[PDB]
């Protein structure tokens, strides 16, 4: 209930069940799930989207419980992980939307407040993903590399 960018104190979340093994009723096997996953990834779908689709359109509760491994790591296994994690990417996209708003009109000083907050979030994730050897440390971020990468 930390919630940096507000005073939020909500614990609304999702709690995994006890069984790390697959449920008894399920019929499909791991390899077929993996092939479905990779075909979905080749569609150009972000891993979280594919996880949601697996949960909804099928009895794919956990990628790890069924196929022994999580979505991003599998997508790394077949050499198909995108350059930027979906998290940072979506944040950059929202930042670009904010930037286009503020360039369109000026008196949105409260939108400047949101801008500084969001870009702080980007700075946090940038430090993290530089430490953990995901992005090369050379990577920085001001306004325009976002415009090129996202668009």
């Amino acid at each position: 209930m930390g919630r940096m960018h507000s005073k939020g104190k909500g614990m609304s979340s999702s709690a995994i069940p006890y069984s790390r093994n697959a449920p008894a009723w399920f019929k499909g096997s791991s390899d077929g799930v993996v092939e479905q996953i990779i075909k979905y990834a080749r569609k150009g779908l972000t891993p979280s989207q594919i996880g949601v689709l697996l949960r909804d359109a099928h009895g794919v509760t956990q990628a790890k419980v069924i196929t022994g491994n999580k979505i991003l790591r599998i997508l790394k296994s077949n050499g198909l992980a995108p350059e930027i994690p979906e998290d940072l990417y979506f944040l950059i996209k929202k930042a670009v939307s904010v930037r286009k708003h503020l360039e369109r009109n000026r008196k949105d000083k409260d939108a400047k407040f949101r801008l500084i907050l969001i870009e702080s979030r980007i700075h946090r994730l940038a430090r993290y993903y530089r430490t953990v050897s995901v992005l090369p440390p050379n990577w920085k971020y001001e306004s325009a590399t976002a415009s090129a990468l996202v668009n």
């Binding site: 614990m11 979340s13 009723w25 909804d56 359109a57």
Partner: protein, 81 residues
């Protein structure tokens, strides 16, 4: 008060506590086995799905999103999984 068997509480007690305050984090969502009106392609549907799912064999809406559990499309039939 002053004694509980919080290691062995009444089952209805956990049932009336929502998520994360149970002894073990026990999700209440489940699955359903669903028959679509159009084709007999039996499918499995999540309780609280989000996507407006249509049958993979034939495109026909089966379940529609809400804040909580997604409404069925009023056309299909269901049984407990």
């Amino acid at each position: 008060v002053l004694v509980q068997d919080l290691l062995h509480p009444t089952a209805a007690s956990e049932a009336r506590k929502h998520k994360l305050k149970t002894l073990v984090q026990s999700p209440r969502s489940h699955f359903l086995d669903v028959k679509c009106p159009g084709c007999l392609n039996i499918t499995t549907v999540f309780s609280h799905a989000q996507t407006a799912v249509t049958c993979e064999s034939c495109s026909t809406v089966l379940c529609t999103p809400t804040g909580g559990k997604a409404k069925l499309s009023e056309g299909t039939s269901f049984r407990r999984k």
